[PDB]
Write a protein that binds this ligand. Structure first.
Ligand SMILES: N[C@@H](Cc1c[nH]c[nH+]1)C(=O)O
Length: 231
């Protein structure tokens, strides 16, 4: 019996489809972690909202989908030790007047459904019509390109990856460290999972052996500050 791992492979550089195969930082880290934990696994591309549903039903044993550790998600799920630090940013067209998150007032914001980016947008301007929720971040960014939304709030490394990969779209990343707090990714599990402890120990092995850093350098071209993982 293999471990069923779910991911939403529409979140580059962490997980995405390349020539019909699921690739990314989370994909490479998962492979490293699971082999260090001695667990045969299957990686499923399932979708963002199906994934969380599947984890609650326990049909999926494990998740790695650039998922931010939050106390709101700790209600139903368990998390591994953090393996990445992120923050929400604001993605816009280069000609945007947006300088900070407060400039987004009265404007339409495209977020992926049930994410920390949605939460951040709803924290500032409350729940309402000009917060447009999409199943993938890919589609949210697509509503930005065509003018359907004025701004996108998503994770920083994803936004930076899209700007880097797509210069002809002429998008810019607006950072607001005053409004957006530090976030940490964790591998997710159904409540009281027996895999969590094995994954935590395997992650340490992966970090200690220098395996994590090689994967980090591959996707981000620089040395990680590993002290971000002991916060
Ligand atoms: N890290 C954010 C955004 C995200 C990760 N994967 C898809 N969206 C979250 O877990 O809510």
């Amino acid at each position: 019996k293999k471990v069923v791992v779910g991911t939403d492979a529409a979140f580059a550089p962490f997980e995405y489809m390349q020539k019909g195969k699921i690739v990314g930082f989370d994909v490479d880290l998962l492979d490293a972690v699971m082999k260090a934990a001695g667990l045969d696994y299957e990686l499923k591309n399932i979708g963002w909202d199906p994934l969380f549903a599947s984890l609650q039903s326990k049909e999926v044993d494990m998740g790695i989908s650039g998922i931010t550790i939050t106390d709101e998600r700790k209600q139903s799920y368990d998390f591994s030790d953090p393996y990445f630090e992120a923050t929400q940013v604001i993605l816009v067209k280069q000609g945007s007047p947006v300088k900070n998150a407060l400039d987004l007032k009265g404007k339409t914001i495209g977020v992926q459904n049930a994410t920390t980016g949605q939460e951040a947008a709803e924290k500032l301007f409350g729940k309402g019509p000009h917060i447009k929720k999409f199943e993938t971040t890919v589609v949210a960014i697509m509503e930005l390109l065509n003018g359907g939304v004025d701004a996108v709030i998503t994770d920083n490394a994803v936004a930076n990856e899209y700007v880097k990969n797509n210069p002809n779209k002429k998008l810019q990343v607006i950072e607001d460290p005053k409004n957006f707090a530090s976030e940490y990714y964790g591998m997710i599990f159904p409540k009281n999972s027996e895999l969590k402890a094995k994954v935590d120990e395997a992650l340490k092995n992966v970090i200690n052996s220098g395996k994590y850093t090689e994967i980090y350098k591959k996707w981000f071209g620089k040395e990680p500050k590993l002290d971000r993982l002991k916060q």
